[PDB]
């Protein structure tokens, strides 16, 4: 097993926060470039800018982590999920994990106050 697959890289740990930031920026560019491929491949119901506004907000989730190396494991997980989606390795059932909120508007009586929590004793 001398040789890798198409997009897989040797994992390597950036010594600085800036080099990590450079890799993450290139990575978001890779997702954003491959995003119209995904809607063709995974045959999804919805549009490409919805994919893009998810890929933005997922990195918005982890914008505010302090550590170098916790962002390093976070980058490696992101690169592996890129590796999955760029091929046929995930299937569209597993691809549509990332949009639970889009496909169905939730339903009647989403509990907001204390009372709607209370009448179904917090679901």
């Amino acid at each position: 097993a001398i040789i890798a697959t198409a997009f897989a890289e040797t994992v390597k740990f950036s010594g600085s926060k800036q080099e990590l930031q450079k890799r993450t920026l290139a990575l978001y560019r890779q997702f954003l470039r491959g995003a119209p491929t995904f809607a063709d491949l995974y045959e999804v119901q919805f549009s490409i800018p919805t994919i893009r506004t998810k890929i933005r907000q997922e990195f918005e989730r982890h914008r505010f982590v302090d550590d170098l190396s916790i962002q390093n494991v976070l980058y490696a997980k992101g690169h592996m999920e890129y590796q999955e989606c760029i091929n046929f390795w995930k299937q569209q059932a597993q691809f549509l994990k990332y949009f639970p909120e889009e496909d169905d508007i939730q339903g009647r009586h989403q509990p907001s106050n204390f009372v709607d929590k209370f009448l179904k004793n917090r679901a």
């Binding site: 009647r108 009448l119 179904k120 004793n121 679901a123």
Partner: protein, 331 residues
């Protein structure tokens, strides 16, 4: 996994039975509503009892054929979906199928006459036969469905008999809740998109200008389930119409612009049109109906004095948003 079905947890039903939805609402959970859906193998019924068994209400399913009954098992847990056979004829089977049902609906409507059933059979007579036993058993939240354009008047014997069935449901067990949906569209609908998906002829009258607003079927099912459980639905007629009225030329052009094909057009008048549909009744697989001829000159007659989607906090979707999805695999 939460109860987005109910408003609450503890519900006594109208007939006085106590229902406590234990667990957290998922597939393994139990809600407690014993429901019965007549004709559930039909196209509305599959989407209906899917969402109805998604939260673990016990769904009593009466069937007619032993083969099509099978693909509704998968949407329920153990004891959630159950099956039992019946004919519209044998009253004892009606009597049996609703003995413990909290709630019950009947989407029985057949667009063509068999050699054993007519419109007067399966719309006004059989509905009487079943809701009589509903009155005999004090079954709560009885729901009856009729079609759009359900008049007393002649020109479609189907539509002539739908309003007759409405009046019978208003007559006996008189608090029964009547819903009239629009034309419906979904993945493999009955005669409205899959007939428009592939067609060697595509002929009908009117020069393609009958008017309606079609509703996506899952919106009808969610609307029905949100009806099913609350108050403020009892004995109320329900117009369920889509967001914007269409014409057939508009619809078919919206289909063909995504197909990027020449959907054929013949549009010959009524006289030669009728006698060809006359000969199709002797064939066992269902064909276009000779009484579906008449509804082509008819359009969506909306009653203003009814209650919409926005009664129950729902907004259905628009057909132009869905056109890429539903007739995608014919590309």
């Amino acid at each position: 996994n939460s109860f987005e079905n109910l408003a609450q947890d503890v519900n006594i039903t109208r007939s006085g039975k106590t229902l406590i939805a234990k667990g957290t609402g998922g597939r393994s959970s139990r809600t407690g509503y014993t429901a019965t859906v007549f004709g559930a193998n039909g196209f509305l019924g599959s989407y209906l009892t899917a969402k109805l068994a998604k939260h673990g209400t016990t769904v009593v399913v009466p069937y007619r054929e032993e083969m099509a009954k099978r693909h509704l098992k998968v949407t329920g847990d153990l004891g959630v979906v159950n099956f039992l056979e019946m004919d519209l004829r044998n009253l004892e089977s009606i009597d049996e199928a609703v003995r413990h049902s909290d709630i019950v609906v009947n989407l029985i409507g057949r667009e063509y006459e068999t050699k054993n059933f007519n419109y007067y059979d399966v719309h006004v007579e059989g509905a009487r036969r079943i809701a009589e036993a509903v009155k005999k058993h004090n079954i709560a939240r009885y729901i009856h469905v009729s079609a759009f354009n359900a008049e007393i008047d002649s020109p479609s014997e189907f539509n002539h008999t739908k309003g007759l069935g409405e009046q019978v449901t208003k007559d006996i067990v008189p608090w029964a809740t009547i819903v009239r949906p629009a034309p419906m569209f979904g993945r493999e609908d009955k005669w409205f998109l899959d007939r428009m998906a592939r067609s060697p002829c595509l002929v009908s009258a009117n020069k393609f200008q009958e008017t309606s607003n079609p509703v996506h079927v899952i919106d009808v099912a969610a609307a029905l389930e949100r009806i099913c459980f609350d108050d403020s639905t009892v004995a109320q007629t329900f117009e369920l119409y889509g967001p914007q009225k269409f014409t057939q030329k508009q619809i078919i052009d919206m289909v063909s612009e995504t197909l990027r094909k020449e959907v054929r057009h013949i549009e010959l008048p009524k006289a030669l049109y009728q006698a060809y549909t006359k000969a199709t009744q002797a064939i066992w697989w269902p064909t276009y109906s000779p009484d579906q001829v008449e509804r082509q000159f008819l359009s969506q007659k909306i009653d203003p004095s009814a209650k919409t989607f926005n009664d129950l906090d729902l907004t259905p979707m628009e057909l132009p948003d869905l056109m890429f999805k539903l007739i995608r695999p014919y590309r």
